[PDB]
Design a protein around this ligand. Structure first.
Ligand code: NAP
Ligand code: NAP
Ligand code: NAP
Ligand code: NAP
Ligand code: DX2
Ligand code: DX2
Ligand code: DX2
Ligand code: DX2
Lengths: 249, 247, 239, 249
C-alpha cells in the first residue's frame, strides 16, 4: 500500500515541485492551496493521469484565527478520508511581504505572516500527531533567518518560530516514531513581481553558480528527509542555499 | 533630564528587579502589569518614595487580539505622557506553560505567541514610531534544548530572537539598539517543591544555583548603558553554563 | 566511474562510508594509519565485487612538518589509481579527553587538532589544487554541548566547522561543494542510548554513510556549507 | 589587594585598550607582547606613572611549537611573580592574514594562525586554571566567524576553535569558580596597511553608525564580563559588531 503526504501551498512553485517529486517517489498526495484553484486542480489532474486515484486538492486559508485549528484538522482529515493514512506532512505554504517598523492592517499582517509560517504548521503538526512505518514532517524554513531582509520582521519572526517548532516537535514526537526536520532555501524561485536587473542582483550573490535554486533542488532535500535514508535524522535543518548564508555584507 | 524606561510585566520577579535596577541607575519607569495590581502599585510607591514622580503603573493584557496593537501603542504613549520621553523598552512579560502536541488551543496561541512575540513586535513598532535609545528582549538560553511539551512557548521565544535581529537591523539607522538577555534557570516557580528546585539547580555548572533576578537585571543594565553603545542584535546568555550541558 | 578518497576508512564509520560509496558506483581509496589488515580486507571485498575499484593508502595524519606532504600524496594516490578525484571524505579522527586541570600536551595537540582539522584543511587544499565535485567533513552534533574534559577534541571539531564554511565559500567558484555530517552517538568506543529521543539507540554507521551519500549525490547539487546532524535528536535534549 | 590580569598582545590597538581599561578599573596588568617591545614598555611606563608597580611587560611568541606550553606557563607565572595572584586572563593576541586554498610555508601559517588564535589560549587557560574572588577568562573572538572573509580559512578555523575552547573551558572550569566568556568584534580597528577607500567600504556595511568599533567599545564589553555584574555569566560570547553580522550579501 502506497504512503500518503500532505503538502501545503502545493499548487505552484516550490510546493508543486515537492508534491510532484513525492508522487514520483510513490506517494499519494493532498495538494493544499488557498487562492490557486486552477493550478491545484491542474496538478491533481496531471498526477491522477499518471496513476489513478492518487491526488486530491484541499482548499484552506492558513491565516491565524479562532477557526485555524479546525481548518488544519480538516487538511489532515482529508488525507485520511482520501487515502486512509497520512505518512508525511510538508509545511510549505507561506505568506511573505514587508512589514516595516517605521494596505492591510497590522492585525491582518500578524495573522497572515505568523499564521502561515508558524501557527498553521504547529496546528497541522498537532493534528498529524494526534491522528497517528516512516512518519515524518518537513518544514520549509529560510537559510537567511539570521541575516534577514530589511523590513521583513514579521515574516522573519514567523520563520524563527518555525525553527523552534521543528526542534520542539522533533523532541516531543520522537517517542511516536515521527521525525521532524527542515529544509531552508536561500534564494530560490524569485518573485513574479520583481524586476529582472534585481533578480540578477540576488543571483550574483550566490557563490555556487551565481544562480537561484530550482524548485526541484529544494524538493530533492525534502525527498531525502522523508526517505528511509534519513531514519536517524530528526530536529535537523538542511540549508539548500548555494552558500548564500556564508557571504558577508 | 532623567531618561525613561517601559518594563513589561514589572510587578514581580525578574521584571521587578529590572525596573528596580533601572530606577537605581536614574531612570523614571513605567511599571506595566496584567493581573498583579497590588504588587505593581507597591513597587511604584517604593520607587516614588526614593524619588518623587519617577514611577507610574500601566495595566494591559498582552495576549494576541485585534486590540493588542492599540494596547501596545497606549503603553508607549503612557511613558511619553508621564515623563515626556521614552528611552528604553524592556520586553519582559511572558506567558509560560506546557502545550502538548498529543484553555482552548486558540487561547494558548494568543497568550504564548502574543506575550512572547507579537506584543514585543507591536511595542517595538510603537516605540520606534514615537522617536542612547535601546530595546532589550527577555529571551531564553534553552531555546535549542527546549523543555518537553513547551512548543508554543519555544516558538514564541524563537520568534523573539528573530524580532531582536530584524529590529536591530531596521532600527540601527535611527540609532536605536535592540538586544536580548537570555536567562537559563532563574527564579523557579513559587509552588515548585524544593526537591524539584534542586534538580534544576544541580544542572547548572556555575555554582549549582539558579540566577537571581538581580543577575538577569545586571545584563539588562549593561545593554542599555553607554558601555554597550556599539552592541546591537546581540543576545547575552545569563545561564551559568546550563545551555552547554549535554543530556 | 567517479572516484572518492575516504580517510580512516578501514573500520567503523569510515568503512561504512567507503562501502556505500562503492555500492553507489565510486572507485575508492581506502586510507588507513594503523589498520593495514582491515584496510586490505575491505579492499579485497570491494575488488571481488568489481575488479580494480578499490586501493589502499597508508598515512599518519598527526600534525607535523610532513603532514602537508602526506595529505598531498593521499590525493595523488586517487589520481594515480583512478585518473580523477571527485569526492573527499574527511572522516579520520582522534578522540580522547584532555583535561584542563601518557601523551605530552604537544602530542595531544598534534593528534586532536592535526587529524581533526589541519589534515582536513591540507587535504582540501590538495584536492582543490589538483582540479560533481564535493568534500564531506565528519563533524560532531554535540559541538555546542561538549563532553566534559574534551577541550582539544571540541576545538578541533569546531575548527572543522570553520573549514567547512570557509572552504564552501572559497571553492564554490570552482564548483566544489563542501558540507558536513555531524553524528551524535553512533558506534560506541546504554546510558547514552536512553538519552536519544529517536528509538533510544545509537546510529548505525550505515545511517551516517546515508547522509554522506546524499551530500555527494546529484540530489545535493545546490547544497554547500551545510552540516547535516544525524543524531536522532540527541542535541535537542537539555541537561 | 588589587586583582591582577594578563592581557596577551596588549602593546597596541584593542589589547592596549583592554589593558588600559582594566588598569583604570583597578587591576595590575601583565602587558604581553611579541614584536612590539617599544610600544609595550611605553604602555607600562604610562600605567606605572599612574600607579607605581602596577604594570609589567612579558615577551613571548605564541606560535604553536613544542615549547609553546612552557611559554604559556611562564606568562601566567609572570603575573604571580609580579603581583602574587592572577585573576583575569584576556586572550587577545592573534595572527591574521590570508591563506588561500587555491612567503611563509604552510606549516608556519598553521603554527601561527592556529597557535595564536586557539592553542595558546588553550595552554594559557590550562596554566591559569592550574595556578589557582572573581576569576575569569575572556577570549577575543570574531562576530564574522560564520560569514568569513574569503581566503582566510586558517584564521577562521582558529577563531572557531576559540569558540569551542570558550564553551569547553566554561563547562569544565565552572566547578572551580572560573568563568570563561568571549567578546566578538565585527569591524573594529582597521588594518594599518589598508587604504582609506577600502576602510570606507567596510564602514558603510555597519548598520549602527556606518563606522567601525573603537578599541574602547570592545574593551567595555571585556570589562563587563570580568566585573561583578557578570557573576552568573559563563560560556557566553558577546558580539560587539554594530549589527554587521546581521547584514546579508
Ligand atoms: N522562493 C524563495 O527564494 C524562498 C527562499 C527562502 C525560503 N523559502 C520558503 O520555501 C517555501 C516555498 O517558497 P515559495 O517561494 O514557493 O512560496 P510562495 O510562492 O511565496 O508561497 C507558497 C504558497 O503559499 C500559499 N499561501 C500564501 N498565503 C497563504 C494563506 N494565507 N493560506 C494558505 N496558503 C497561503 C500560496 O497559496 P495559493 O497560491 O494557493 O494562494 C502560495 O502558492 C516557503 O515556505 C518559503 O518561505 C522560499
Ligand atoms: N524564570 C526563569 O528561569 C526564566 C528562564 C528563561 C527565560 N525567562 C524569561 O525572563 C522573563 C522574566 O521571567 P519571569 O520568570 O520573571 O516571568 P513570569 O514570572 O513568568 O512572568 C512575568 C510577568 O509576565 C506577565 N504576563 C503574563 N501573561 C501576560 C499577559 N497575557 N499579558 C500581559 N502580561 C502578562 C505577568 O504579569 P502579571 O503578574 O501582572 O499578571 C507576569 O508577572 C520572561 O520573559 C521569561 O520568559 C525566565
Ligand atoms: N562514533 C561516534 O558516535 C561519533 C560521534 C560524533 C562524531 N563522530 C565522527 O565520525 C567520524 C568517524 O567516527 P568513528 O567513531 O568511526 O572514528 P574512530 O573509530 O574514532 O576513528 C576513525 C579512524 O580515524 C583514523 N585515525 C585516528 N587517528 C589517526 C591518525 N593520527 N592518523 C591517521 N588516521 C587516524 C583511524 O584509522 P586507523 O584505524 O587506520 O589507525 C580510525 O580508524 C569521526 O570524524 C568522528 O569525530 C563519531
Ligand atoms: N581589528 C578588528 O576589526 C577585529 C575584528 C574581529 C576580531 N578581532 C579580534 O580582536 C582581537 C584584537 O584585534 P586587533 O586588530 O587589535 O589585533 P592585531 O593588532 O591584529 O593583533 C594583536 C596582537 O597580536 C599579537 N600577535 C600576533 N602574532 C603573534 C604571535 N605569533 N605571538 C604572540 N603574539 C602575536 C601582536 O603582538 P606584537 O605587536 O607585540 O607583535 C599584536 O599586537 C584579536 O583577537 C582579533 O582577532 C579584531
Ligand atoms: N513564502 C515565501 N518566502 C520567501 N522567503 C520568499 N522569498 C522570495 C525571494 C525572492 C528573491 C530573493 C529572495 C527571496 C520570494 N520571491 N518568495 C518567497 N515566498
Ligand atoms: N515567562 C516565563 N518564562 C520561563 N521560561 C519561565 N521559566 C521558569 C522556570 C522554572 C524552573 C526551571 C526552569 C524554568 C519559570 N518558573 N517561569 C518562567 N516564566
Ligand atoms: N573519532 C571519534 N570521534 C568521536 N566523537 C567519537 N565519539 C564516540 C562516542 C561514543 C559514545 C558517546 C559519544 C561519542 C566514539 N565512540 N568514537 C568517536 N570517535
Ligand atoms: N588579529 C586580527 N584579527 C582580525 N579579525 C583583524 N581584523 C581586521 C580587519 C579590518 C577591516 C575589516 C575587518 C577586519 C584587522 N585590521 N586586524 C585584525 N587582526
Amino acid at each position: 500500500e502506497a504512503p500518503a503526504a500532505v503538502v501545503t501551498g502545493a499548487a505552484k512553485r516550490i510546493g508543486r515541485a515537492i508534491a510532484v517529486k513525492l508522487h514520483q517517489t510513490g506517494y499519494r498526495v493532498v495538494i493544499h492551496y488557498h487562492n490557486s484553484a486552477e493550478a491545484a486542480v491542474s496538478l491533481a489532474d496531471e498526477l491522477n493521469k499518471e496513476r489513478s486515484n492518487t491526488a486530491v486538492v484541499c482548499q484552506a486559508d492558513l491565516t491565524n484565527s479562532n477557526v485555524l485549528p479546525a481548518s488544519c484538522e480538516e487538511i489532515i482529515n482529508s488525507c485520511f478520508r482520501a487515502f486512509g493514512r497520512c505518512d508525511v506532512l510538508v509545511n510549505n505554504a507561506s505568506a511573505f511581504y514587508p512589514t516595516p517598523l517605521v494596505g492591510k492592517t497590522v492585525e491582518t499582517q500578524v495573522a497572515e505572516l505568523i499564521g502561515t509560517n508558524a501557527i498553521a504548521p504547529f496546528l497541522l503538526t498537532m493534528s498529524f500527531a494526534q491522528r497517528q512505518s516512516n512518519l515524518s514532517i518537513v518544514n520549509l524554513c529560510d537559510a537567511m533567518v539570521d541575516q534577514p531582509c530589511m523590513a521583513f520582521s514579521l515574516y522573519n519572526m514567523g520563520k524563527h518560530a518555525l525553527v523552534g517548532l521543528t526542534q520542539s516537535a522533533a523532541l516531543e514526537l520522537a517517542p511516536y516514531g515521527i521525525r521532524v526536520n527542515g529544509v531552508a532555501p536561500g534564494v530560490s524561485l524569485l518573485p513574479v513581481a520583481m524586476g529582472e536587473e534585481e533578480k540578477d542582483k540576488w543571483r550574483r550573490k550566490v557563490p555556487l553558480g551565481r544562480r537561484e535554486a530550482s524548485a526541484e533542488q529544494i524538493a530533492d532535500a525534502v525527498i531525502f528527509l522523508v526517505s528511509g535514508s534519513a531514519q536517524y535524522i530528526t530536529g535537523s535543518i538542511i540549508k539548500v542555499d548555494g552558500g548564500l548564508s556564508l557571504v558577508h555584507a
